[PDB]
Amino acid sequence: EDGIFLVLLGLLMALVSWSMDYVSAKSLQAYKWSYAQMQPSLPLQFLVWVTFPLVLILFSALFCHLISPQAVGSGIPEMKTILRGVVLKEYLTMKAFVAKVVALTAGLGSGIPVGKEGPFVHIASICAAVLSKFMYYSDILTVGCAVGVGCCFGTPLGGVLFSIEVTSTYFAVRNYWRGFFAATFSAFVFRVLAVWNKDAVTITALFRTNFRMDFPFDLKELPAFAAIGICCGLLGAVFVYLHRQVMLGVRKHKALSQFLAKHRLLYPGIVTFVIASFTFPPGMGQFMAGELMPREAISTLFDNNTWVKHAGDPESLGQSAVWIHPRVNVVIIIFLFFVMKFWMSIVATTMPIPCGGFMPVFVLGAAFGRLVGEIMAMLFPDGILFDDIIYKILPGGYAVIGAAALTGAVSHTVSTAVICFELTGQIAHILPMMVAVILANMVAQSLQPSLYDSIIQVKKLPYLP
Amino acid sequence: EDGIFLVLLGLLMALVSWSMDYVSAKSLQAYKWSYAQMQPSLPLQFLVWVTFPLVLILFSALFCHLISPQAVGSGIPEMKTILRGVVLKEYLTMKAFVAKVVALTAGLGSGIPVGKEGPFVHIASICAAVLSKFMYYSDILTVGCAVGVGCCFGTPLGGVLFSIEVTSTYFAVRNYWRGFFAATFSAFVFRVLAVWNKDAVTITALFRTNFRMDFPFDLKELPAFAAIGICCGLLGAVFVYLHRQVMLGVRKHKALSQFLAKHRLLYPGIVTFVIASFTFPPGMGQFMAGELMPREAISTLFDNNTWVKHAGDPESLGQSAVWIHPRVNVVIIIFLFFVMKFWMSIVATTMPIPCGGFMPVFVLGAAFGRLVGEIMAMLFPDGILFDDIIYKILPGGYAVIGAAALTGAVSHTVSTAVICFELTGQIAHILPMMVAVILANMVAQSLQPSLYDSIIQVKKLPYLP
Ligand SMILES: [Cl-]
Ligand SMILES: [Cl-]
Ligand SMILES: [Cl-]
Ligand SMILES: [Cl-]
Numbered sequence: 001e002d003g004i005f006l007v008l009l010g011l012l013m014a015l016v017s018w019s020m021d022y023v024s025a026k027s028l029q030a031y032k033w034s035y036a037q038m039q040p041s042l043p044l045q046f047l048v049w050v051t052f053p054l055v056l057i058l059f060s061a062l063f064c065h066l067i068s069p070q071a072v073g074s075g076i077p078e079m080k081t082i083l084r085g086v087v088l089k090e091y092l093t094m095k096a097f098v099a100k101v102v103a104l105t106a107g108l109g110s111g112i113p114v115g116k117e118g119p120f121v122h123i124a125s126i127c128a129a130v131l132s133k134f135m136y137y138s139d140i141l142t143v144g145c146a147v148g149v150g151c152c153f154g155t156p157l158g159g160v161l162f163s164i165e166v167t168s169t170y171f172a173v174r175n176y177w178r179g180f181f182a183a184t185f186s187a188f189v190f191r192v193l194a195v196w197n198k199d200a201v202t203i204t205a206l207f208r209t210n211f212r213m214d215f216p217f218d219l220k221e222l223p224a225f226a227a228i229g230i231c232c233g234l235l236g237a238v239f240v241y242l243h244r245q246v247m248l249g250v251r252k253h254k255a256l257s258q259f260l261a262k263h264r265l266l267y268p269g270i271v272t273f274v275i276a277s278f279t280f281p282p283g284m285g286q287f288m289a290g291e292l293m294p295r296e297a298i299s300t301l302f303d304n305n306t307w308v309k310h311a312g313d314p315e316s317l318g319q320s321a322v323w324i325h326p327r328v329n330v331v332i333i334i335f336l337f338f339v340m341k342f343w344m345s346i347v348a349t350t351m352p353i354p355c356g357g358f359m360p361v362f363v364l365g366a367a368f369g370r371l372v373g374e375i376m377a378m379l380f381p382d383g384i385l386f387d388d389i390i391y392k393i394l395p396g397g398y399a400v401i402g403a404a405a406l407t408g409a410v411s412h413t414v415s416t417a418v419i420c421f422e423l424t425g426q427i428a429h430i431l432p433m434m435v436a437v438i439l440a441n442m443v444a445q446s447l448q449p450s451l452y453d454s455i456i457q458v459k460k461l462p463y464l465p
Numbered sequence: 466e467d468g469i470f471l472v473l474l475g476l477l478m479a480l481v482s483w484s485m486d487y488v489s490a491k492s493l494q495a496y497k498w499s500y501a502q503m504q505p506s507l508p509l510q511f512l513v514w515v516t517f518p519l520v521l522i523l524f525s526a527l528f529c530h531l532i533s534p535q536a537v538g539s540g541i542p543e544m545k546t547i548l549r550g551v552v553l554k555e556y557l558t559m560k561a562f563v564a565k566v567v568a569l570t571a572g573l574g575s576g577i578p579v580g581k582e583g584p585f586v587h588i589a590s591i592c593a594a595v596l597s598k599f600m601y602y603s604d605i606l607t608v609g610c611a612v613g614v615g616c617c618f619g620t621p622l623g624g625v626l627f628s629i630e631v632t633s634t635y636f637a638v639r640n641y642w643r644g645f646f647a648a649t650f651s652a653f654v655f656r657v658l659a660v661w662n663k664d665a666v667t668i669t670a671l672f673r674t675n676f677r678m679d680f681p682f683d684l685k686e687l688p689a690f691a692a693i694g695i696c697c698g699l700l701g702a703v704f705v706y707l708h709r710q711v712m713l714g715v716r717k718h719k720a721l722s723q724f725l726a727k728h729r730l731l732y733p734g735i736v737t738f739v740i741a742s743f744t745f746p747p748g749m750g751q752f753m754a755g756e757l758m759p760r761e762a763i764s765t766l767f768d769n770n771t772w773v774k775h776a777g778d779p780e781s782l783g784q785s786a787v788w789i790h791p792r793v794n795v796v797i798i799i800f801l802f803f804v805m806k807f808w809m810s811i812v813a814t815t816m817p818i819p820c821g822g823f824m825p826v827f828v829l830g831a832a833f834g835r836l837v838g839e840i841m842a843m844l845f846p847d848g849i850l851f852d853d854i855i856y857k858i859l860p861g862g863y864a865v866i867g868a869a870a871l872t873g874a875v876s877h878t879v880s881t882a883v884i885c886f887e888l889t890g891q892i893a894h895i896l897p898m899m900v901a902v903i904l905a906n907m908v909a910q911s912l913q914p915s916l917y918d919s920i921i922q923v924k925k926l927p928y929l930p
Contacts, residue, residue, distance in 0.1 A: 172634065172635060177879075
């Protein structure tokens with residue numbers, strides 16, 4: 001019967017993931033078009049920029065309130081609690097499935113720092129439970145997690161490895177085989193649908209990069225990759241620390257908690273309003289590449305161009321031209337993007353909506369990575385002679401490493417190295433990604449608990465040692 | 466103390482692996498040069514072609530006999546037995562380490578189908594045990610296996626995943642973390658040494674390929690990838706079946722066993738002599754690309770050229786020119802290579818030397834893969850129009866899939882998909898590799914037990930259910 005269960009779980013999740021991306025994309029196109037149509041008047045540009053995401057976030061928060069409060073958050077803290085032996089039954093119901101899928105879709109389409117992966121671990125877990133009931137949570141949820149990550153982005157190995165790291169002491173080998181099968185199948189279907197819908201041509205990586213694959217880096221820049229690893233460790237520790245402090249403040253502050261406890265939806269309202277206010281292009285958005293939606297932030301941060309060099313005509317960068325302000329060195333623009341998004345990301349992940357920190361952190365990591373890359377590009381401008389031609393620093397490589405390393409530091413995982421290279425489609429940098437991730441973890445684990453463990457402690461979940 | 470143990474295990478194995486490759490390479494250069502120096506006289510070309518490998522194989526077999534009989538074979542059947550709870554103490558001694566490393570090196574340098582990976586799982590396992598004793602076999606050997614594969618080729622994930630599949634029921638998460646760390650570190654050092662010794666320039670994949678990474682295949686050829694998967698399943702089942710029959714025959718036949726039991730070294734002698742006799746270039750080697758040593762068989766089978774099209778001047782193929790006989794379609798040459806090597810590989814893996822079937826099967830798989838690729842290249846010669854240019858079938862992709870799939874079928878593993886793409890350095894074909902491997906396993910597991918399990922049964926090892 002496993003053949004039926006595993007195929008249907010895999011297939012149905014491929015369809016949920018694909019449909020969600022389809023709709024999310026349409027929301028963002030509607031947003032950009034609507035904004036563009038107001039081009040001659042700043043008050044209307046502001047109105048659109050801000051109200052479009054207020055509507056979607058308030059809808060998301062409200063929908064969960066009305067259908068299933070258990071849909072709020074990333075799921076993973078509760079799934080871990082269940083894997084440890086305490087069955088929080090209320091998080092594996094069809095009501096949560098509906099609330100989660102609907103509200104998440106609305107959230108993603110807003111442009112607000114809301115991840116997708118976290119929620120998919122939960123969505124797949126529920127599906128696995130429901131199919132099983134229709135037709136032993138340690139095995140249901142383990143397969144679920146692998147499928148969730150797999151179908152979320154089209155990243156099979158990422159999923160399987162994740163399903164191991166989320167366990168307690170012992171992992172059953174039988175789940176390795178079941179998870180691997182289902183996650184691979186699901187990912188395959190997901191990418192084929194993209195081709196069918198004229199958005200891929202062949203089966204490809206989700207955020208495919210275009211690095212040289214020929215002398216991709218020298219040994220002389222390995223110290224930079226190592227430095228990114230260590231720095232990501234520290235940044236990750238800070239991210240988690242501050243996240244905790246925000247959650248506790250909102251819940252415990254003597255007066256704030258009285259107010260927000262009654263007037264629900266103020267918190268979503270205000271958080272969203274402020275993030276939108278700062279990102280408006282004519283205001284600070286021009287200094288933060290604020291026109292970029294999460295996927296475009298990734299697409300441009302993993303570019304193969306060297307922004308500090310592309311003078312004369314910035315339009316030659318295509319979409320990446322958004323980073324080249326007429327009066328500000330691109331290094332500063334990257335710095336400001338990182339800093340501003342850092343706190344926006346922390347706060348956004350505390351809103352009462354479906355959300356997660358994987359993709360927010362991934363982007364912050366990429367930004368940090370280019371900051372390092374673009375700076376070295378100004379220090380070693382001459383390049384290296386090999387086989388009669390000159391090879392130069394390729395900052396996109398640093399972005400890829402930074403994304404993996406910071407994610408690692410925040411979650412306490414090494415699976416992120418794999419998810420990241422499956423997303424880019426190129427493995428020129430495997431060994432330095434893996435080393436940077438290990439270093440990031442050694443540092444982060446010595447300072448602060450995983451993001452998920454901080455949440456488990458804060459929410460006082462019945463997590464057995 | 467784990468920090469010391471894991472670093473030293475990782476480091477020392479990187480040095481054993483690197484040193485072994487260094488020496489193996491020198492033996493092969495000596496072999497080819499010596500052969501070339503006899504160019505005007507066929508009797509001397511024959512003498513060199515054959516006697517060079519007789520000396521090395523007989524040395525290998527003899528050395529193990531004299532130092533440690535327990536060094537013979539692939540180790541893995543015994544390591545699995547130990548992981549199940551029966552401590553075959555005699556296979557984790559320094560005597561085995563010495564016999565194994567010395568005899569293996571000699572074997573690899575002969576050009577005879579002798580793998581490297583199997584033996585490295587064992588070599589690393591012994592090192593892990595010895596360091597531990599110097600300073601709980603389930604944890605010693607699990608880390609050992611990850612390091613073995615890691616340092617063998619420079620393939621971290623391959624190692625970690627392998628260390629899971631070799632276990633019984635439960636895998637300890639703590640070993641995931643220890644193995645991942647050590648295998649990554651070891652692989653890193655291994656590749657850096659290659660750069661230092663002027664054999665890499667940067668850190669690279671071991672057998673780096675050069676595929677387009679742009680429209681790498683169409684959906685219309687996915688049925689071929691699937692067909693390779695299924696066929697590999699069947700071929701794998703046959704390989705294992707025949708391997709078993711040979712082992713049993715040698716041990717049980719009424720008269721043969723009497724003879725060979727006394728006159729040791731006849732079996733190595735005769736097997737080696739025959740494999741050499743058939744591969745001699747002026748004889749059948751010209752119809753089997755017999756000039757190629759294992760690594761060159763891989764390098765040319767994973768080429769980015771289309772051999773059935775490269776008419777006019779075969780020298781434009783460089784090294785791959787060896788496959789283009791003046792009077793024989795390259796498809797036949799590939800076919801004969803596959804068939805002849807298939808039985809040579811089976812028999813070679815029964816000799817009383819350090820050896821294994823991973824790399825032999827890997828090559829057979831690659832050959833089969835191109836056979837499919839090169840044939841389709843003659844059926845769909847027109848190509849596909851995309852972005853104003855024409856894309857055509859790229860058979861090297863089929864070779865990569867075939868290598869992974871056949872290996873999968875023979876061992877009953879999916880980790881081979883990962884080892885394979887880490888070896889090529891390109892992940893354009895991840896999803897079709899993974900699907901082909903899954904299909905190969907579904908077929909093979911329905912027909913015959915893993916190569917290793919057949920051996921465990923044949924040798925009557927005390928393998929608890
Ligand atoms: Cl969360
Ligand atoms: Cl996320
Ligand atoms: Cl063997
Ligand atoms: Cl091998």
